[PDB]
Amino acid sequence: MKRTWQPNRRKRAKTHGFRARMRTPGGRKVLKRRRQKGRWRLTPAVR
Amino acid sequence: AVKKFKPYTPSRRFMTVADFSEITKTEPEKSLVKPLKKTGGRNNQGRITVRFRGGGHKRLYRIIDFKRWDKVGIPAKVAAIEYDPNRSARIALLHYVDGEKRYIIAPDGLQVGQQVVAGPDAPIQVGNALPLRFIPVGTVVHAVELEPKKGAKLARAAGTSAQIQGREGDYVILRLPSGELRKVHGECYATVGAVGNADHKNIVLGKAGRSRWLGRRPHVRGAAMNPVDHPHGGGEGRAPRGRPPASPWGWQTKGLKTRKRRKPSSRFIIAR
RNA sequence: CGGUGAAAUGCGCAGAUACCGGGAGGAACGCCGAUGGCGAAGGCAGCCACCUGGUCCACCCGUGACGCUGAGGCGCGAAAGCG
RNA sequence: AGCCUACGGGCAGGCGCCGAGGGUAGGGCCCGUGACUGGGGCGAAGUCGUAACAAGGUAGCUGUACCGGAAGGUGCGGCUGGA
RNA sequence: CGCGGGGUGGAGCAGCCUGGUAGCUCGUCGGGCUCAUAACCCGAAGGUCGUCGGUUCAAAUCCGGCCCCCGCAACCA
RNA sequence: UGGUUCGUGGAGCCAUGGGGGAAUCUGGGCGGACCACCGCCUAAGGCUAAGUACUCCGGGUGACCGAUAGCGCACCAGUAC
RNA sequence: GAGCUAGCCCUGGCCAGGGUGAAGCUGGGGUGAGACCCAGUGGAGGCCCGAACCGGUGGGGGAUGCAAACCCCUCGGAUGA
RNA sequence: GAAUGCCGGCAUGAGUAACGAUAAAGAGGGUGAGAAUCCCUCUCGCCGUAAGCCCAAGGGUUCCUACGCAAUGGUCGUCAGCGUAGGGUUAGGCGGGACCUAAGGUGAAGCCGAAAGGCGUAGCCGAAGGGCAGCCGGUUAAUAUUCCGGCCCUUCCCGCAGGUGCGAUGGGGGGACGCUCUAGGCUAGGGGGACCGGAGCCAUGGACGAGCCCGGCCAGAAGCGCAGGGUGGGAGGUAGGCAAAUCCGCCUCCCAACAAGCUCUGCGUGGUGGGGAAGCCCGUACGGGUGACAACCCCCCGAAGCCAGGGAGCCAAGAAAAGCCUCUAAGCACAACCUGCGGGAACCCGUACCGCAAACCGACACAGGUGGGCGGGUGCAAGAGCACUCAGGCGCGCGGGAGAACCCUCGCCAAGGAACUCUGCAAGUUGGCCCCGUAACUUCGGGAGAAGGGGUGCUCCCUGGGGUGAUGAGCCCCGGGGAGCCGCAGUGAACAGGCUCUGGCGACUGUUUACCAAAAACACAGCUCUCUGCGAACUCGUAAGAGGAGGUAUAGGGAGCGACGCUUGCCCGGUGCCGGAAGGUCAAGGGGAGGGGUGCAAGCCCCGAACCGAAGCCCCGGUGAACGGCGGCCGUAACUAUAACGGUCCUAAGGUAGCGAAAUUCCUUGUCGGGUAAGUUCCGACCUGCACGAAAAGCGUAACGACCGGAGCGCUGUCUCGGCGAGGG
RNA sequence: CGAUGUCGGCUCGUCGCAUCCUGGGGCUGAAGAAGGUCCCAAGGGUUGGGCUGUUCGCCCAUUAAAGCGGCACGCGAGCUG
Ligand SMILES: [Mg+2]
Ligand SMILES: [Mg+2]
Ligand SMILES: [Mg+2]
Ligand SMILES: [Mg+2]
Ligand SMILES: [Mg+2]
Ligand SMILES: [Mg+2]
Ligand SMILES: [Mg+2]
Ligand SMILES: [Mg+2]
Ligand SMILES: [Mg+2]
Ligand SMILES: [Mg+2]
Ligand SMILES: [Mg+2]
Ligand SMILES: [Mg+2]
Ligand SMILES: [Mg+2]
Ligand SMILES: [Mg+2]
Ligand SMILES: [Mg+2]
Ligand SMILES: [Mg+2]
Ligand SMILES: [Mg+2]
Ligand SMILES: [Mg+2]
Ligand SMILES: [Mg+2]
Ligand SMILES: [Mg+2]
Ligand SMILES: [Mg+2]
Ligand SMILES: [Mg+2]
Ligand SMILES: [Mg+2]
Ligand SMILES: [Mg+2]
Ligand SMILES: [Mg+2]
Ligand SMILES: [Mg+2]
Ligand SMILES: [Mg+2]
Ligand SMILES: [Mg+2]
Ligand SMILES: [Mg+2]
Ligand SMILES: [Mg+2]
Ligand SMILES: [Mg+2]
Ligand SMILES: [Mg+2]
Ligand SMILES: [Mg+2]
Ligand SMILES: [Mg+2]
Ligand SMILES: [Mg+2]
Ligand SMILES: [Mg+2]
Ligand SMILES: [Mg+2]
Ligand SMILES: [Mg+2]
Ligand SMILES: [Mg+2]
Ligand SMILES: [Mg+2]
Ligand SMILES: [Mg+2]
Ligand SMILES: [Mg+2]
Ligand SMILES: [Mg+2]
Ligand SMILES: [Mg+2]
Ligand SMILES: [Mg+2]
Ligand SMILES: [Mg+2]
Ligand SMILES: [Mg+2]
Ligand SMILES: [Mg+2]
Ligand SMILES: [Mg+2]
Ligand SMILES: [Mg+2]
Ligand SMILES: [Mg+2]
Ligand SMILES: [Mg+2]
Ligand SMILES: [Mg+2]
Ligand SMILES: [Mg+2]
Ligand SMILES: [Mg+2]
Ligand SMILES: [Mg+2]
Ligand SMILES: [Mg+2]
Ligand SMILES: [Mg+2]
Ligand SMILES: [Mg+2]
Ligand SMILES: [Mg+2]
Ligand SMILES: [Mg+2]
Ligand SMILES: [Mg+2]
Ligand SMILES: [Mg+2]
Ligand SMILES: [Mg+2]
Ligand SMILES: [Mg+2]
Ligand SMILES: [Mg+2]
Ligand SMILES: [Mg+2]
Ligand SMILES: [Mg+2]
Ligand SMILES: [Mg+2]
Ligand SMILES: [Mg+2]
Ligand SMILES: [Mg+2]
Ligand SMILES: [Mg+2]
Ligand SMILES: [Mg+2]
Ligand SMILES: [Mg+2]
Ligand SMILES: [Mg+2]
Ligand SMILES: [Mg+2]
Ligand SMILES: [Mg+2]
Ligand SMILES: [Mg+2]
Ligand SMILES: [Mg+2]
Ligand SMILES: [Mg+2]
Ligand SMILES: [Mg+2]
Ligand SMILES: [Mg+2]
Ligand SMILES: [Mg+2]
Ligand SMILES: [Mg+2]
Ligand SMILES: [Mg+2]
Ligand SMILES: [Mg+2]
Ligand SMILES: [Mg+2]
Ligand SMILES: [Mg+2]
Ligand SMILES: [Mg+2]
Ligand SMILES: [Mg+2]
Ligand SMILES: [Mg+2]
Ligand SMILES: [Mg+2]
Ligand SMILES: [Mg+2]
Ligand SMILES: [Mg+2]
Ligand SMILES: [Mg+2]
Ligand SMILES: [Mg+2]
Ligand SMILES: [Mg+2]
Ligand SMILES: [Mg+2]
Ligand SMILES: [Mg+2]
Ligand SMILES: [Mg+2]
Ligand SMILES: [Mg+2]
Ligand SMILES: [Mg+2]
Ligand SMILES: [Mg+2]
Ligand SMILES: [Mg+2]
Ligand SMILES: [Mg+2]
Ligand SMILES: [Mg+2]
Ligand SMILES: [Mg+2]
Ligand SMILES: [Mg+2]
Ligand SMILES: [Mg+2]
Ligand SMILES: [Mg+2]
Ligand SMILES: [Mg+2]
Ligand SMILES: [Mg+2]
Ligand SMILES: [Mg+2]
Ligand SMILES: [Mg+2]
Ligand SMILES: [Mg+2]
Ligand SMILES: [Mg+2]
Ligand SMILES: [Mg+2]
Ligand SMILES: [Mg+2]
Ligand SMILES: [Mg+2]
Ligand SMILES: [Mg+2]
Ligand SMILES: [Mg+2]
Ligand SMILES: [Mg+2]
Ligand SMILES: [Mg+2]
Ligand SMILES: [Mg+2]
Ligand SMILES: [Mg+2]
Ligand SMILES: [Mg+2]
Ligand SMILES: [Mg+2]
Ligand SMILES: [Mg+2]
Ligand SMILES: [Mg+2]
Ligand SMILES: [Mg+2]
Ligand SMILES: [Mg+2]
Ligand SMILES: [Mg+2]
Ligand SMILES: [Mg+2]
Ligand SMILES: [Mg+2]
Ligand SMILES: [Mg+2]
Ligand SMILES: [Mg+2]
Ligand SMILES: [Mg+2]
Ligand SMILES: [Mg+2]
Ligand SMILES: [Mg+2]
Ligand SMILES: [Mg+2]
Ligand SMILES: [Mg+2]
Ligand SMILES: [Mg+2]
Ligand SMILES: [Mg+2]
Ligand SMILES: [Mg+2]
Ligand SMILES: [Mg+2]
Ligand SMILES: [Mg+2]
Ligand SMILES: [Mg+2]
Ligand SMILES: [Mg+2]
Ligand SMILES: [Mg+2]
Ligand SMILES: [Mg+2]
Ligand SMILES: [Mg+2]
Ligand SMILES: [Mg+2]
Ligand SMILES: [Mg+2]
Ligand SMILES: [Mg+2]
Ligand SMILES: [Mg+2]
Ligand SMILES: [Mg+2]
Ligand SMILES: [Mg+2]
Ligand SMILES: [Mg+2]
Ligand SMILES: [Mg+2]
Ligand SMILES: [Mg+2]
Ligand SMILES: [Mg+2]
Ligand SMILES: [Mg+2]
Ligand SMILES: [Mg+2]
Ligand SMILES: [Mg+2]
Ligand SMILES: [Mg+2]
Ligand SMILES: [Mg+2]
Ligand SMILES: [Mg+2]
Ligand SMILES: [Mg+2]
Ligand SMILES: [Mg+2]
Ligand SMILES: [Mg+2]
Ligand SMILES: [Mg+2]
Ligand SMILES: [Mg+2]
Ligand SMILES: [Mg+2]
Ligand SMILES: [Mg+2]
Ligand SMILES: [Mg+2]
Ligand SMILES: [Mg+2]
Ligand SMILES: [Mg+2]
Ligand SMILES: [Mg+2]
Ligand SMILES: [Mg+2]
Ligand SMILES: [Mg+2]
Ligand SMILES: [Mg+2]
Ligand SMILES: [Mg+2]
Ligand SMILES: [Mg+2]
Ligand SMILES: [Mg+2]
Ligand SMILES: [Mg+2]
Ligand SMILES: [Mg+2]
Ligand SMILES: [Mg+2]
Ligand SMILES: [Mg+2]
Ligand SMILES: [Mg+2]
Ligand SMILES: [Mg+2]
Ligand SMILES: [Mg+2]
Ligand SMILES: [Mg+2]
Ligand SMILES: [Mg+2]
Ligand SMILES: [Mg+2]
Ligand SMILES: [Mg+2]
Ligand SMILES: [Mg+2]
Ligand SMILES: [Mg+2]
Ligand SMILES: [Mg+2]
Ligand SMILES: [Mg+2]
Ligand SMILES: [Mg+2]
Ligand SMILES: [Mg+2]
Ligand SMILES: [Mg+2]
Ligand SMILES: [Mg+2]
Ligand SMILES: [Mg+2]
Ligand SMILES: [Mg+2]
Ligand SMILES: [Mg+2]
Ligand SMILES: [Mg+2]
Ligand SMILES: [Mg+2]
Ligand SMILES: [Mg+2]
Ligand SMILES: [Mg+2]
Ligand SMILES: [Mg+2]
Ligand SMILES: [Mg+2]
Ligand SMILES: [Mg+2]
Ligand SMILES: [Mg+2]
Ligand SMILES: [Mg+2]
Ligand SMILES: [Mg+2]
Ligand SMILES: [Mg+2]
Ligand SMILES: [Mg+2]
Ligand SMILES: [Mg+2]
Ligand SMILES: [Mg+2]
Ligand SMILES: [Mg+2]
């Protein structure tokens, strides 16, 4: 039956995107935490 | 006279529709008036505030002249009686000899081609707006301001009417549709005549459909909820509400009066 | 204070009853008034206007038997009652 | 496919409609009958109260409505078979 | 089998906790009023306080044992 | 009300949100309620190195590990997944 | 974290085919004028049967499954909340 | 040496279960070291409102070709969606952006918040919505509305030519709109044809015949033609459209009333361009040629699509902005704008492929899920249903034998028909259309498809209506009557109600525990109570702000009851709520009688009683469709029994109506009556109601229900009681 | 209690005997037939339905009889629920 992951580039980019992380001060620390540990991708790769 | 149905399907033997005979051949609306789309919304900036709203037919707002001192001494003629879905009552299209077109609340007995004037003059006959100061004692009035030059805010629903009872200095006291004797200022404009379409009282919706069409979503009783939801909720079969009856937020619902007693407007109010 | 055959219930020192001034509201119209009038009955009463029916008198003018009653049907129909 | 005494015929026979009646299904009227139940009539000296007849001790009667163990009471309007 | 209330003249209730007094209403009995009855008036009687003990100077009263009566309880598998 | 060892305690001192509200050396605070005496300071403006803390970073050393140990990774690991 | 789920807002789409035949309009009738009664037209409705579509009533199968909700027959709604 | 310990490795079950829809395979021939599994051919089977085509999302090289088979593939593999390498995606007209706005996001001014941050008018962003200019064919192994061919368009910028007061993000019009039903004419699509064009074929008994088979199209500027949509034209006056307008709006006479006229679509025909079968022959997976100088004609059905902003009805009253047309303001009227012609300039991104699925979402080449368009023909009344079948695509990536038990999914049955069982669970009977005919009850709609019946095929004859063709033949749509034929049987296969009687609950359509409960639960129209006079009550938020509501007592919130009919009785003593400028108590504060600590004293610092002191509580009243409550013991009548009657006690008042062994009853399978041969269930009664009862409503109620109970008819493998056969294991 | 699934029915049984029948027998208030009661005896048999979830029980129609118990109140890696 219908499952949870119903993909959408639009939704993924506007929800988990860099420009959405940079609005909220909470999402700005997500970037801080990922740069400091060495994530190759601070953001889900949306195309 | 509201028109009724035959029981060719259940929920039509009780269903009743308003008589649309007074609505003249102006069924679509008037642009250069009604410039606004009505914003449908049950909720403020997120959370719901007033419960059980949503759905219902899509509506365009008709802008209504509650400020009838714009056109003092400038007459108009009534050219249309129209349906306003935003209201209980009907609206009337006024063509001012000035050239401007405006909607108004449509009083009882107001017929098409009758001309209507606003101002300190404009004699006592249905549709004309005057200040409450000049309208004779004992007459019936609608579209009443509570404070001068803030807009008509009283006696606007269908069939409603406020009656002038007397004066005390520069204030006039009014019997409001609730029965409250309120002492409102003399310079408040108010339109003489009753509202009309008083048969709005008598229309039966017949089914849940006509409520959902008006945007009234199903109202859920606290008796059928749970103690985490409502004070009345819980227990085995049909608890008899076990306490003085309350709202979902705890305040009692039968008899507990809820106006601020320290209101500055309390010394203008006489009755219930 | 009320009330009664007499009392009691009741109302009132939180200001009652009796008095005055103002305000609100609803119902019914005193005197005229009658042993009266009107209507087919039920029934109809302060006053004003409009719309309206029945009826009486005189004049003997026109139609000229068009008249009486009336099973059905149809309308009206106190008070109480019903939506 | 038969039988005939005078054969582009007759009989027997075959088929078909109608058909008494039997069956199936659903209705209409009537009669008997049924735990229990309503009210009626009569019955012997039973129980409770006193409604009506004399202003029947609250004048009575009535249409209606509500209430009461029961007669009955009371509200609205009406009647003279009351003053 | 449990918990807590009660058994008082013929009927229905008081009086018990704070012991020394048994009162109320109806009913029964006698006499009035009436012609007689009911209504009413006057005047009377009638209670081993469920039984068995012990407590005290003394028990309807306080404390236990039985016999009756009333109410609640008798759950989780 | 908060800080201080101080939890309303005899509760000062130091900051305060609210109300009232001075003085300029014969002026003001303090020395644990308070009062006298005796002493100590001079609020309601600001700046100020050094000694002190830490280790992304380089070096030295180790009765530290020696590939299930030692950082999660000695290996292109914050990777694959 | 509302890319599943619940609700609501903005903006588009979908609902084969049949039945039934409300109001209303036309004519005739009826009346003093009406009420109203007949046909003919009309095509209403959380109307009816029934596909897509949305569900998930009963049974059977499945049970380290095809499947961490499935399959088969049967079944409800299907112009509307 | 143990911690269901952690990590890794290897065992047992075990060559066992399984190898993923029962749509199905067989042979011949190639390649090959190796073939059931790759390629080709012949035969067979499956889908065909898909299992076939075109899009969107998502996926991101999977597309094509060459060389290959370690691993991936539930087996094999020479094959691949797999490995290595190379190639492939071409746009002014398609979609998106250098256009617009919707919800929403954001946000100069402004408001708010300890900080971080929350709002917020204008503006900006924001799209399957509005706007906007491409159709038909051919080429590649792989792209094409993109390249090529023909035909046709759109913006700019620069020039000449002819017109006019030109000119804004400003004013106005327009854009611009619901649901259902629909009329006229077209088109898409489809059927037929003696007509036209075609390779060929006369088989096995017959047929050289208007025989068989196949094909008889596409696009196309202006001009026409046919349908159809939009719109009145003058004069004045003019205070409104936030400046101004000649525009719009409002009056007032005149002129038409209409598509007459102006445009604007759509559909035909149009210069011209292109395509073109079956069958035959070959070198491939694949296509090529001829068949052709191809013919390319006539009828009928015909849309849900077009003309479109068409019409009618209804109430629940149906986006905004830009483009577009018009009007003027600054400024400018050498500028500028309009029409026609010429030349030149037209950028960025996507474009392969999968796309109901082996490429997406489910760890899998997973029987699940996934939005939009086309979806042919024949028959069955219709239809996207059902059966067969075009084009097209498949036989589902383990097979081969055997013919046990047992299981799943099927099919049939003697006599009996529910005796099965918790229950006719399941399975069966019935089943489409037409025509008869149809009860109680009813809210007059219904109940109703009640029930129960009859006809159903084929051939021949006569005959009535329409539609398109001219009134006619023809083609098509509906009917009526008569005479016959055949079989067991004519909706001859597939799709397609079992029915009735009677109770409980709930009025009904509807909603619900994604994943054990669909209901008597929820909701619902409607009833009542109560709050709220508008900066409303209430809700979110510290606040700002917002919902309520751009609403106003016929409105809005909260609570309960739950269509409809007849009704809803008594108690305000305790609790809640409502009303009471009395009185009692009451905190901070005021007030200081009086007392204390230090000073030599002025003084400084403490306590500190009268009394003034709010709400609240106490007190006094009210109120039940507010929380709630609505008795006990005795005796009494013509036999017995019972108690209409009385006595006493207590309460705030002591359950009225209407129901009642019930979704409520313990004793209890209460007691009578009905159904049965037999009835702890069912129905109707009685009332001793452990422990009904009036808006947590009471008693009824037509219709309705995948709800729950009882019964009967039809029918049956449920059973007596089994048996046989089939396919997948 | 790091799990011993619980009533009833169905299927399959098996065992004890204190025996329901059939077999043998003593007493009888056993004339005969039919009974009563006790002893030996388990080899075999021990029906079909209505009601209820029911075991039990009450019925209906029969019968030679319509036996009582055990087996985790036998039997859910056998079924139902
Ligand atoms: Mg607009
Ligand atoms: Mg917002
Ligand atoms: Mg937000
Ligand atoms: Mg509700
Ligand atoms: Mg609940
Ligand atoms: Mg919660
Ligand atoms: Mg609560
Ligand atoms: Mg709570
Ligand atoms: Mg007065
Ligand atoms: Mg009044
Ligand atoms: Mg007169
Ligand atoms: Mg004369
Ligand atoms: Mg009356
Ligand atoms: Mg009335
Ligand atoms: Mg009444
Ligand atoms: Mg002859
Ligand atoms: Mg015959
Ligand atoms: Mg016959
Ligand atoms: Mg017959
Ligand atoms: Mg016959
Ligand atoms: Mg016979
Ligand atoms: Mg018969
Ligand atoms: Mg008949
Ligand atoms: Mg009878
Ligand atoms: Mg009397
Ligand atoms: Mg008397
Ligand atoms: Mg009397
Ligand atoms: Mg009377
Ligand atoms: Mg009375
Ligand atoms: Mg009277
Ligand atoms: Mg008399
Ligand atoms: Mg007199
Ligand atoms: Mg006593
Ligand atoms: Mg006592
Ligand atoms: Mg005596
Ligand atoms: Mg006496
Ligand atoms: Mg438990
Ligand atoms: Mg418990
Ligand atoms: Mg502190
Ligand atoms: Mg402190
Ligand atoms: Mg302390
Ligand atoms: Mg301190
Ligand atoms: Mg301060
Ligand atoms: Mg200090
Ligand atoms: Mg100090
Ligand atoms: Mg100091
Ligand atoms: Mg000191
Ligand atoms: Mg100091
Ligand atoms: Mg300083
Ligand atoms: Mg500093
Ligand atoms: Mg330091
Ligand atoms: Mg280092
Ligand atoms: Mg390591
Ligand atoms: Mg090693
Ligand atoms: Mg969502
Ligand atoms: Mg959602
Ligand atoms: Mg239809
Ligand atoms: Mg009609
Ligand atoms: Mg319809
Ligand atoms: Mg429907
Ligand atoms: Mg239905
Ligand atoms: Mg259906
Ligand atoms: Mg479709
Ligand atoms: Mg779905
Ligand atoms: Mg199911
Ligand atoms: Mg279910
Ligand atoms: Mg299942
Ligand atoms: Mg159905
Ligand atoms: Mg349906
Ligand atoms: Mg050890
Ligand atoms: Mg170990
Ligand atoms: Mg384990
Ligand atoms: Mg391990
Ligand atoms: Mg092994
Ligand atoms: Mg083997
Ligand atoms: Mg094995
Ligand atoms: Mg095996
Ligand atoms: Mg196997
Ligand atoms: Mg497979
Ligand atoms: Mg070879
Ligand atoms: Mg897209
Ligand atoms: Mg894409
Ligand atoms: Mg993938
Ligand atoms: Mg690759
Ligand atoms: Mg490939
Ligand atoms: Mg190859
Ligand atoms: Mg391989
Ligand atoms: Mg290799
Ligand atoms: Mg392999
Ligand atoms: Mg696999
Ligand atoms: Mg090879
Ligand atoms: Mg490859
Ligand atoms: Mg650019
Ligand atoms: Mg540019
Ligand atoms: Mg833009
Ligand atoms: Mg804009
Ligand atoms: Mg800030
Ligand atoms: Mg913001
Ligand atoms: Mg924009
Ligand atoms: Mg955009
Ligand atoms: Mg767009
Ligand atoms: Mg678009
Ligand atoms: Mg475009
Ligand atoms: Mg391709
Ligand atoms: Mg092409
Ligand atoms: Mg111009
Ligand atoms: Mg312009
Ligand atoms: Mg505009
Ligand atoms: Mg504009
Ligand atoms: Mg065509
Ligand atoms: Mg055609
Ligand atoms: Mg030919
Ligand atoms: Mg031949
Ligand atoms: Mg053809
Ligand atoms: Mg053409
Ligand atoms: Mg004009
Ligand atoms: Mg202007
Ligand atoms: Mg016209
Ligand atoms: Mg043309
Ligand atoms: Mg060709
Ligand atoms: Mg070919
Ligand atoms: Mg239209
Ligand atoms: Mg704009
Ligand atoms: Mg235009
Ligand atoms: Mg492409
Ligand atoms: Mg492509
Ligand atoms: Mg699709
Ligand atoms: Mg997949
Ligand atoms: Mg995959
Ligand atoms: Mg999975
Ligand atoms: Mg596969
Ligand atoms: Mg499926
Ligand atoms: Mg789908
Ligand atoms: Mg089609
Ligand atoms: Mg088809
Ligand atoms: Mg046929
Ligand atoms: Mg059909
Ligand atoms: Mg279609
Ligand atoms: Mg097929
Ligand atoms: Mg094929
Ligand atoms: Mg397979
Ligand atoms: Mg056979
Ligand atoms: Mg059989
Ligand atoms: Mg048979
Ligand atoms: Mg039978
Ligand atoms: Mg049975
Ligand atoms: Mg049985
Ligand atoms: Mg049953
Ligand atoms: Mg069944
Ligand atoms: Mg059949
Ligand atoms: Mg019947
Ligand atoms: Mg019925
Ligand atoms: Mg009918
Ligand atoms: Mg039938
Ligand atoms: Mg029926
Ligand atoms: Mg035939
Ligand atoms: Mg024609
Ligand atoms: Mg045609
Ligand atoms: Mg036949
Ligand atoms: Mg069928
Ligand atoms: Mg029923
Ligand atoms: Mg029952
Ligand atoms: Mg569930
Ligand atoms: Mg669950
Ligand atoms: Mg359901
Ligand atoms: Mg109601
Ligand atoms: Mg909020
Ligand atoms: Mg707040
Ligand atoms: Mg607001
Ligand atoms: Mg608003
Ligand atoms: Mg409300
Ligand atoms: Mg309300
Ligand atoms: Mg309820
Ligand atoms: Mg309810
Ligand atoms: Mg009724
Ligand atoms: Mg009540
Ligand atoms: Mg009370
Ligand atoms: Mg009270
Ligand atoms: Mg009270
Ligand atoms: Mg009170
Ligand atoms: Mg109060
Ligand atoms: Mg004080
Ligand atoms: Mg003081
Ligand atoms: Mg006070
Ligand atoms: Mg006696
Ligand atoms: Mg009594
Ligand atoms: Mg009572
Ligand atoms: Mg009960
Ligand atoms: Mg039976
Ligand atoms: Mg019986
Ligand atoms: Mg019985
Ligand atoms: Mg019963
Ligand atoms: Mg009973
Ligand atoms: Mg109840
Ligand atoms: Mg109640
Ligand atoms: Mg109810
Ligand atoms: Mg009932
Ligand atoms: Mg009911
Ligand atoms: Mg019913
Ligand atoms: Mg149901
Ligand atoms: Mg339903
Ligand atoms: Mg039933
Ligand atoms: Mg069987
Ligand atoms: Mg077999
Ligand atoms: Mg087999
Ligand atoms: Mg255990
Ligand atoms: Mg164990
Ligand atoms: Mg023995
Ligand atoms: Mg024996
Ligand atoms: Mg013997
Ligand atoms: Mg013998
Ligand atoms: Mg013997
Ligand atoms: Mg049974
Ligand atoms: Mg047992
Ligand atoms: Mg046994
Ligand atoms: Mg036991
Ligand atoms: Mg057992
Ligand atoms: Mg089991
Ligand atoms: Mg069991
Ligand atoms: Mg159960
Ligand atoms: Mg079950």
Residue numbers in the entry:
A (entry chain R7): 1 to 47
B (entry chain RD): 2 to 273
Authors' text:
During protein synthesis, ribosomes select correct aminoacyl-tRNAs (aa-tRNAs) by monitoring the nucleotide (nt) pairing between the anticodon of the tRNA and the codon on the mRNA in the aminoacyl (A) site. Decoding is thought to be governed by a conformational transition in the ribosome—open (off) to closed (on)—that occurs upon codon–anticodon pairing in the A site. Ribosomal ambiguity (ram) mutations increase miscoding and map to disparate regions, consistent with a role for ribosome dynamics in decoding, yet precisely how these mutations act has been unclear. Here, we solved crystal structures of 70S ribosomes harboring 16S ram mutations G299A and G347U in the absence A-site tRNA (A-tRNA) and in the presence of a near-cognate anticodon stem-loop (ASL).
